[PDB]
Amino acid sequence: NLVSDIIGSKKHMEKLISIIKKCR
Amino acid sequence: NLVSDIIGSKKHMEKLISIIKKCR
């Protein structure tokens, strides 16, 4: 939610970090 | 405000997050 999503997106970002890593 | 600051920074991240897709 508006509060959890902030933190949740942080876990998603991890995946985003996992993505950049493809480069990396 | 962490709530607004993080969610806000995310907006800034979104853009960065967008670039990664175009890595590529």
A3–B3 C-beta distance less than 8 A: yes
The CA distance from B21 to B4, in Å, is 25
Q: Do residues B23 and A21 touch, judged by C-beta distance below 8 A? A: no
CA distance B20 to chain A (A): 6
Q: Which two tokens stand for residue B20?
A: 């990664």
3-class DSSP assignment, residue A5: helix
To the nearest whole angstrom, how far is the Cα of A8 from the nearest Cα of chain B?
11
Helix (H) or strand (E) holding A19: helix A4-20
Which member of A5, A9, A20 has the closest CB to residue B20? A20
Experimental method of this PDB entry: NMR
